[PDB]
Design an enzyme around this catalytic site. Structure first.
Site, short mmCIF file in Angstrom:
data_model
loop_
_atom_site.label_atom_id
_atom_site.label_comp_id
_atom_site.label_asym_id
_atom_site.label_seq_id
_atom_site.Cartn_x
_atom_site.Cartn_y
_atom_site.Cartn_z
N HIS A 37 38.86 39.84 75.63
CA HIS A 37 38.55 38.45 75.96
C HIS A 37 38.91 38.06 77.41
O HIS A 37 38.53 36.98 77.85
CB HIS A 37 39.14 37.46 74.93
CG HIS A 37 40.64 37.36 74.90
ND1 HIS A 37 41.35 36.78 75.94
CD2 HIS A 37 41.50 37.62 73.89
CE1 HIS A 37 42.62 36.80 75.57
NE2 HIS A 37 42.75 37.30 74.34
N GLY A 91 49.07 33.10 78.22
CA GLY A 91 49.36 34.24 79.09
C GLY A 91 49.98 35.43 78.39
O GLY A 91 50.18 36.47 79.02
N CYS A 139 48.69 37.23 75.85
CA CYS A 139 47.73 38.19 75.26
C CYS A 139 47.83 39.52 75.97
O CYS A 139 48.03 39.57 77.18
CB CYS A 139 46.31 37.65 75.27
SG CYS A 139 46.10 36.13 74.30
C1 LIG Z 1 46.28 34.89 75.52
N1 LIG Z 1 46.33 35.11 76.80
C2 LIG Z 1 46.40 33.50 74.99
C3 LIG Z 1 47.78 33.20 74.38
C4 LIG Z 1 47.51 32.18 73.25
C5 LIG Z 1 46.14 32.76 72.69
N2 LIG Z 1 45.44 33.20 73.91
C6 LIG Z 1 44.11 33.27 74.14
O1 LIG Z 1 43.67 33.60 75.23
C7 LIG Z 1 43.15 33.00 72.97
C8 LIG Z 1 41.78 33.64 73.26
C9 LIG Z 1 40.73 33.45 72.18
C10 LIG Z 1 40.87 34.49 71.08
C11 LIG Z 1 39.34 33.52 72.79
N3 LIG Z 1 43.06 31.56 72.70
C12 LIG Z 1 42.62 30.69 73.79
C13 LIG Z 1 43.31 31.12 71.42
O2 LIG Z 1 43.67 31.89 70.54
C14 LIG Z 1 43.17 29.67 71.09
C15 LIG Z 1 42.71 28.58 71.78
C16 LIG Z 1 42.83 27.44 70.91
C17 LIG Z 1 42.57 26.07 71.00
F1 LIG Z 1 42.09 25.60 72.18
C18 LIG Z 1 42.78 25.18 69.98
C19 LIG Z 1 43.28 25.68 68.80
F2 LIG Z 1 43.50 24.84 67.75
C20 LIG Z 1 43.56 27.02 68.64
F3 LIG Z 1 44.05 27.46 67.47
C21 LIG Z 1 43.34 27.91 69.69
N4 LIG Z 1 43.53 29.28 69.81
C22 LIG Z 1 48.59 32.20 72.19
O3 LIG Z 1 48.92 33.17 71.53
N5 LIG Z 1 49.12 30.96 72.10
C23 LIG Z 1 48.52 30.08 72.99
C24 LIG Z 1 48.78 28.73 73.21
C25 LIG Z 1 48.04 28.06 74.16
C26 LIG Z 1 47.06 28.72 74.89
C27 LIG Z 1 46.80 30.06 74.67
C28 LIG Z 1 47.54 30.75 73.71
#
Ligand SMILES: *C(=N)[C@@H]1C[C@@]2(CN1C(=O)[C@H](CC(C)C)N(C)C(=O)c1cc3c(F)cc(F)c(F)c3[nH]1)C(=O)Nc1ccccc12
Ligand SMILES: *C(=N)[C@@H]1C[C@@]2(CN1C(=O)[C@H](CC(C)C)N(C)C(=O)c1cc3c(F)cc(F)c(F)c3[nH]1)C(=O)Nc1ccccc12
Lengths: 296, 302
Positions: free
Chosen positions: A41, A137, A139
């Site tokens: 991703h 950050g 991931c």
């Molecule tokens: C990785 N660098 C980060 C860390 C994060 C998840 N993450 C992602 O990049 C995820 C990529 C997706 C699989 C495309 N990501 C953005 C999410 O999992 C994600 C985004 C959202 C929402 F905007 C709303 C929501 F309700 C939700 F469940 C989401 N999940 C991680 O582990 N924790 C976290 C918190 C904030 C931002 C990113 C990440």
């Protein structure tokens, strides 16, 4: 004496962490030999085959601290991006890739910008989620176990669910559970308690001088399984009885006797090992490695 | 999101662990530069552990009496000196894996990571807190002495603890890296009792702010309290007094959630009088006191 949520020494894994940047997205990468594994991703602004064909080698900025690594190739394996690099990691340990079963535990080395921030123990929940601690950050952060002197990579962090629990893949890019690498609202199945792990934690309590929960009763594996259902507990198998054997011999308490104690604990509800709940994040091997003093 | 008992990445400390043997006693040593720090009780005889005279036993030791091993490399001891309860062994070679480090003495309530080791090799890493009675609730077996406690801000390893002994209750006691014991403990196998332990109030309040940050609000209430009334309650529950200094350090967490410290104190007062009623906070069914306000900020902010 003592019983803590003990992670594996993260030294071997820290030497593998690198920063991967693609566009305005920065996450972590696992540098093993001359390949950097990271969540695919990182190429999103999705059609992964399309976006990957429009990428060149220098579109991927890989940093090992202050040393920029030159990408000499790139390929996709399921949900992981594999970046061929010009130099092999001198700190690559003896390692292998494994896919863990629900109920199995592992250490997570949380990283930001390719640098390790912290380390903690996690269990692969029966609904295929992990209850981790990850911010934006993180991931590319990995989960691992250590057997003898071999790092067993079993998890790579990819996403967080709307419920606050996390989801990711094995090092082959195969997601654990029914999750997809889309920034979409995804729901985890109804979670259950890891029965064999609670039993192992009860053996750890006996090892550390906690006996209040013990009882004179014994049970059959079939009757205990009927009870487990009524409490959202995962079934106990004969295979689980065998893996509990070493702990059962060290305390002199049969598995089916500890099952009658667990049945009683579930029906009535003091603290065990400083916890006021039945803890399910310690495998029988975690109890043995802490109580026997296994080193790495 | 998420909240876990997060230890520091132990990589920098693993490169410092060596095995120290003196007679039939084998324990851990911390190899920094060309000095190996270890508990001085390694020079005790199995017979006289009650009242050893450390100055007397150290004068009868030669450099070759100390066998130091860094994995499979035997290090040559070129000198030895005692600093309080720590033994400092001058060695011929400086540790190539010596990180950027410093020595600090923590206050009770402060947390740190413990790298448990046996025979100079790391077994595991957990998070610990210096209890108000000056003990730690570690996980240590025989041969774990010399295992260290540390914190890693930026890229510097703050060594704050070295493991020395276990008390009859199962709790642990040790020194800072200058050999000064935490608390009224002595490095003798004599009958020692730790004082009645108390709950670290400021840490429970910080953990309640972490729960609000992670979407747990069931325990909140509309009530507010005074610092003096809350302190009268803390006494009735074996809780350490909350000081105005603790209110100031809780400030950043209070501003991020919009909940005043004295309002969270009224919630803690309510939690102590009723319990959990089956509910959990951050996956725990007890009021957790091993997370400082800084630990909450580290984990929730980055
Ligand atoms: C990785 N660098 C980060 C860390 C994060 C998840 N993450 C992602 O990049 C995820 C990529 C997706 C699989 C495309 N990501 C953005 C999410 O999992 C994600 C985004 C959202 C929402 F905007 C709303 C929501 F309700 C939700 F469940 C989401 N999940 C991680 O582990 N924790 C976290 C918190 C904030 C931002 C990113 C990440
Ligand atoms: C260090 N290598 C080991 C690990 C152990 C403590 N420890 C010691 O060497 C301690 C040295 C003393 C300070 C001289 N030690 C032996 C103890 O703390 C100790 C010994 C006893 C008893 F015999 C009885 C007793 F009630 C008691 F409280 C004792 N404390 C450690 O951390 N855990 C442990 C368990 C078993 C053996 C050694 C150690």
């Amino acid at each position: 004496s003592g019983f803590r949520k003990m992670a594996f020494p993260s030294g071997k894994v820290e030497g593998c962490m690198v920063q991967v940047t693609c566009g305005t997205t920065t996450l972590n990468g696992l540098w093993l030999d001359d390949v950097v594994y990271c969540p695919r991703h990182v190429i999103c602004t999705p059609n992964y085959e399309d976006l990957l064909i429009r990428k060149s080698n220098h579109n991927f900025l890989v940093q090992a601290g202050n040393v920029q690594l030159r990408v000499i190739g790139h390929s996709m394996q399921n949900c992981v991006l594999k970046l061929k690099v010009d130099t092999a990691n001198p700190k690559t340990p003896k390692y292998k890739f494994v896919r863990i079963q629900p109920g199995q535990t592992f250490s997570v080395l949380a990283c930001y910008n390719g640098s390790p921030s912290g380390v903690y123990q996690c269990a692969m929940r029966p609904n295929f989620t992990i209850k981790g601690s990850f911010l934006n950050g993180s991931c590319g952060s990995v989960g691992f176990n250590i057997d003898y002197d071999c790092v067993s990579f079993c998890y790579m962090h990819h996403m967080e669910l709307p419920t606050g629990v996390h989801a990711g893949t094995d090092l082959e890019g195969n997601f654990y559970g029914p999750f997809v690498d889309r920034q979409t609202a995804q729901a985890a199945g109804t979670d259950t308690t890891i029965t064999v792990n609670v039993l192992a934690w009860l053996y750890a309590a006996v090892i550390n001088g906690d006996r209040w929960f013990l009882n004179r009763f014994t049970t059959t594996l079939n009757d205990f399984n009927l009870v487990a259902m009524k409490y959202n507990y995962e079934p106990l198998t004969q295979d689980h009885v065998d893996i509990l054997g070493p702990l059962s011999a060290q305390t002199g308490i049969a598995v089916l006797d500890m099952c009658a104690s667990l049945k009683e604990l579930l029906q009535n509800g003091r603290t065990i090992l400083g916890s006021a709940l039945l803890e399910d994040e310690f495998t029988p091997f975690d109890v043995v490695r802490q109580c026997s003093g296994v080193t790495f």
